Design a protein around this nucleic acid. Structure first.
Ligand SMILES: [Mg+2]
Ligand SMILES: [Mg+2]
Ligand SMILES: [Mg+2]
Ligand SMILES: [Mg+2]
Ligand SMILES: [Mg+2]
Lengths: 125, 129, 206, 96, 217, 87
RNA sequence: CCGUAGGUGAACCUGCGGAAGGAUCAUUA
RNA sequence: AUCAAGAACGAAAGUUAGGGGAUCGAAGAUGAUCAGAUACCGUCGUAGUCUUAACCAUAAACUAUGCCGACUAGGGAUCGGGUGGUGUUUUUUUAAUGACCCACUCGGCACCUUACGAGAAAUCAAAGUCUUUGGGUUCUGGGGGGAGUAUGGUCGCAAGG
């Protein structure tokens, strides 16, 4: 089997996690791209790395891969806070201002000493 | 059957201290258990203890703090001489600074130091340290 | 040893009963019997929420008692818990552990996941039990969020809540965050509600 | 209660138990049966004088082949015959 | 040179911890050996046993050397360490590190009267490891260490001089005997004596008061 | 202990556990030092001074460290109606 | 293997009753 | 409460004297076979197996764990009894019960987690409360064979204990 070496794999992983956008589906541009950005000592190894970056540009255009890309990581930096609801489920208007509370928790409310808009609901089994 | 009542009392105290609680339920009572826990109390090895009446024979609550690493009973109540006090004081105590042997003497129940300085002896019950 | 303003404000009690924190599991351990008040007769117990408020008041005092705010570490592996602890670590400056907590992180200084805390918060002590037992080796207090059938060993100041629902865990992390920022001094007025809503901590799966 | 009668009036069962349980020692059984006087060919004595009888060339294989240069000896005081080792001689030219 | 990695290392490398009483009082685990190296100049290692052990792995027979190393002050500090290595010097080296990590203090007390320096153990402690119980009794002054030479050598490497020992079980394995005697001599702090009833205000931890030095960068 | 002359001859007098009054010894690596900062009247914590607890590993390995620590906080005036003196 | 009985046998087999000191997979409520 | 002496019971097989003797079936009578994967296989089958009267007193008679008493963990169950329910069902018209459910409660057969504690470990709510060694009591063991042999006694018709 022609399993590629780990140096070519790791160099392609670094150059695609950091230098994504100028690499494309054409190997011939990627050859002098990795010439102009990377100092690789031999023509054979830089051909290996440029062909592997071409192949990872081939399958990256169909979907996301487990490795790091920037243009997704801004997006899960506003995924943390962009979907704040104006009214949550914990607000009063989703139950018309009066809570759906059984008799025992209303006994907790009247025993602890607080005033609260509760509707007693009778539940069994 | 239940042979000694002091033995089950002190075994219950030792078990409830080795599991680390702060209160026991000693059952039943005697003169001997009451006076034994008074001997522990005068040295401050236990805190409050409390006696509940029930008209049969009373249950005792002892609120033990932490201070008793082991008390115990010597169940064949051997007759001890004045000169035999050093043998039990060397065999069951940790060292020569603390640690007590409780005797029943004809002047009453007292520890081994009080039996030394009373200059009496009697029969051995147990040991509190 | 606390002022009288610190207690249950009724909007927080409405907020607590809105998130269904008072509902719990079916087994009641010997240790956590005082947290239950009584049982709704299907098999679901209801918990004293004043105990949850004052217990998280203790946990807030533990977190505020540390001198270095980066030395407290939040632990999570539940799906709601990663979002909850990253919001808490964003808002108080704690060090979060999201996803798989690395074994050998509390001993074994070689690993780059070695952090030694002085204080550890855990989402539940059953699924994140390995951080509990590795913190049991290097003398660390752990304040935790325990259910009514959680393992109660090796925890101290444990907050009864519901770890099953996303409402209760996101809210209870939010309330711990707002309690410690109201206790540190970032929000001066005790009367003023905190500007961030609790639904920021809430998990959504798209 | 660990299986012994710890009563203050219980010396007799302990003492009969210790008397009957001391027959499991081999040394006690040798001393209070007179084993050293009836089957011991020395008669329980540290030495015994003898008159030699033969030359025993016993071969004794494993693990060490001992070329046994030893003498059958008839004792004097009792008239029974024991074997006897001769030490330190390579030749046994002395005990004829 | 040496770099610390934890807060306990950088406090003593900055010289803020005086001795190892402040480690033992707050029960911080000693995690690197340089803490005990810097805090204790007077530690004398002494090698106990060298045992060649034949080792088999994947039809490969090689010989490893099991080493028993005890370290100790002439004060009350005892370290014991068990490590097997391929070579002799590496085995005794890993012995003095592993004994240097686990150092446990000893409560030295008085037999009977109260004259002079402490000379013996305070109370009788036992210890079990394997099938071996070793019981250490307090002794009068100048009585020597009445012991097997292994546990005797452990006890003049301990700061005591006067102990009677009593043992049981198969004590012909010196690893389990020295382990049980180490547990027994470490068990002395842990007997609640009547002259320590006195309640004390609890000291604040050194990590709390000295929080802004020894911090991670 | 103490000698005759009036000078303490000890290495260290150990930390007693605040639950069961037992000795936290040196290798007790499950032991916990609990720090609670008391509060100012306007809801702030003075970062220098504290109330203080110590729990032995014996109590913590069981799991009544919560219940014993609730008792400690309530009898130190910090809590009310959480731990109950009866059951 | 044990207990009992029998034919024998250079060993050993067989009748009746016990024990595991012998190795619970899958499936379902 | 525990137990020398003494006594009752004691699986299977065995023993005497009867009844029965379907099936199974040690002994025996018979066939084989053909190979060193190998005689287990077959068919009659007596004793027996079944019962009555009397013996016999051994087993891996095992939970391989003396008996009584106290303490040290819970919970899912279950068996027998009891308590309570503006609980259910069974209707006739509401009950009564009967059955089912819940919360208990004693008293049994068992389970699962631990470890505080034990042990050499496997493992153990006892195999814990034991070098910090004592609740009461009965029996047994002291390296392995020789050997449950020799001999003496004792019971039994004998086999045998
Ligand atoms: Mg021996
Ligand atoms: Mg066997
Ligand atoms: Mg008999
Ligand atoms: Mg038998
Ligand atoms: Mg023999």
């Amino acid at each position: 089997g022609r399993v590629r070496t780990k140096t070519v794999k790791r160099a392609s992983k670094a150059l695609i996690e950091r230098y994504y956008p100028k690499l494309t589906l054409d190997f011939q541009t990627n050859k002098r791209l990795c010439d102009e950005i990377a100092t690789i000592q031999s023509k054979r190894l830089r051909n290996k790395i440029a062909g592997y970056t071409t192949h990872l540009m081939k399958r990256i255009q169909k979907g996301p891969v487990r490795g790091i890309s920037f243009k997704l990581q801004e997006e899960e930096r506003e995924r943390k806070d962009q979907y704040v609801p104006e009214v949550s489920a914990l607000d009063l208007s989703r139950s018309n201002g009066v809570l759906n509370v059984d008799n025992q928790t209303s006994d907790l409310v009247k025993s602890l000493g607080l005033k609260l808009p509760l509707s007693v609901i009778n539940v069994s089994a | 059957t239940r042979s000694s009542v002091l033995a089950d009392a002190l075994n219950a105290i030792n078990n409830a201290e080795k599991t680390g609680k702060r209160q026991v339920l000693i059952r039943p009572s005697s003169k001997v258990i009451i006076k034994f826990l008074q001997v522990m109390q005068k040295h401050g090895y236990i805190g409050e203890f409390e006696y509940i009446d029930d008209h049969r024979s009373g249950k005792i609550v002892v609120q033990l703090n932490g201070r008793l690493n082991k008390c115990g009973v010597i169940s064949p109540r051997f007759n001890v001489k004045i000169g035999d006090i050093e043998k039990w004081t060397a065999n069951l105590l940790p060292a020569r600074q603390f640690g007590y042997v409780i005797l029943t003497t004809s002047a009453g129940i007292m520890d081994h130091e009080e039996a030394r300085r009373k200059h009496v002896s009697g029969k051995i019950l147990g040991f509190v340290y | 040893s606390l002022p009288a303003t610190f207690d249950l404000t009724p909007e927080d009690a409405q907020l607590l009963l809105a998130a269904n924190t008072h509902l719990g599991a079916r087994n009641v351990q010997v240790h956590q019997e005082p947290y239950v008040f009584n049982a709704r007769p299907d098999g679901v117990h209801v918990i004293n929420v004043g105990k949850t408020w004052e217990k998280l008041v203790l946990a807030a005092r533990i977190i505020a008692a540390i001198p270095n705010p980066e030395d407290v570490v939040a632990i999570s592996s539940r799906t709601f818990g990663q979002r909850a602890v990253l919001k808490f670590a964003a808002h108080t400056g704690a060090t979060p552990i999201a996803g798989r907590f690395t074994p050998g992180s509390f001993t074994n200084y070689i690993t780059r996941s070695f952090k030694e805390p002085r204080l550890v918060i855990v989402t539940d002590p059953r699924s994140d039990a390995q951080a509990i037992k590795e913190a049991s080796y290097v003398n660390i207090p752990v304040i935790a969020l325990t259910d009514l059938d959680s393992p109660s060993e090796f925890v101290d100041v444990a907050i009864p809540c519901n770890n099953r629902g996303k409402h209760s865990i996101g809210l209870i992390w939010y309330l711990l965050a707002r309690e410690v920022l109201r206790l540190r001094g970032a929000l001066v007025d005790r009367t003023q509600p905190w500007s961030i809503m609790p639904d920021l901590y809430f998990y959504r799966f798209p | 209660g660990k299986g012994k009668p710890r009563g203050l009036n219980s010396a007799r069962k302990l003492r009969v138990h210790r008397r009957n349980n001391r027959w499991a020692e081999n040394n006690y059984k040798k001393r209070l049966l007179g084993t050293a006087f009836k089957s011991s060919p020395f008669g329980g004595s540290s030495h015994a004088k003898g008159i030699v009888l033969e030359k025993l060339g016993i071969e004794s294989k494993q693990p060490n082949s001992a070329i046994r240069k030893c003498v059958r000896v008839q004792l004097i005081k009792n008239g029974k015959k024991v074997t006897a080792f001769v030490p330190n001689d390579g030749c046994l030219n002395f005990v004829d | 040179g040496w770099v610390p990695v934890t807060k306990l290392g950088r406090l003593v490398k900055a010289g803020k911890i005086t001795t190892i009483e402040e480690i033992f009082l707050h029960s911080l685990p000693v995690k690197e050996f340089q803490i005990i190296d810097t805090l204790l100049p007077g530690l004398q290692d002494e090698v106990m046993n060298i045992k060649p052990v034949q080792k088999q792995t994947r039809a490969g027979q090689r010989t490893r050397f099991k080493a028993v190393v005890v370290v100790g002050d002439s004060n009350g500090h005892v370290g014991l360490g068990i490590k097997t290595a391929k070579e002799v010097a590496g085995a005794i080296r890993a012995g003095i590190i592993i004994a240097k990590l686990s150092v446990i203090p000893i409560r030295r007390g008085y037999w009977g009267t109260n004259l002079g320096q402490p000379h013996s153990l305070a109370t009788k402690t036992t210890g079990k490891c394997g099938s071996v119980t070793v019981r250490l009794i307090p002794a009068p002054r100048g009585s020597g260490i009445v012991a097997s030479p292994a546990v005797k050598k452990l006890l003049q490497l301990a700061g005591v001089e006067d102990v009677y020992t009593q043992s049981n079980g198969k004590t012909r394995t010196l690893e389990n005997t020295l382990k049980a005697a180490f547990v027994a001599i470490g068990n002395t702090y842990g007997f609640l004596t009547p002259n320590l009833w006195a309640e004390q205000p609890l000291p604040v931890s050194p990590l709390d008061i000295y929080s802004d030095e020894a911090s991670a960068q | 202990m103490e000698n005759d002359k009036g000078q303490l001859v000890e290495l260290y007098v150990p930390r007693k556990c605040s639950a069961t009054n037992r000795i936290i010894k040196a290798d007790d690596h499950a032991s916990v030092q609990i720090n609670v900062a008391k509060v100012d009247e306007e809801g702030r914590a003075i970062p220098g001074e504290y109330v203080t607890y110590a729990l032995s590993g014996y109590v913590r390995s069981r799991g009544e460290s919560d219940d014993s620590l609730n008792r400690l906080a309530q009898n130190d005036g910090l809590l009310k109606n959480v731990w109950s003196y009866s059951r």
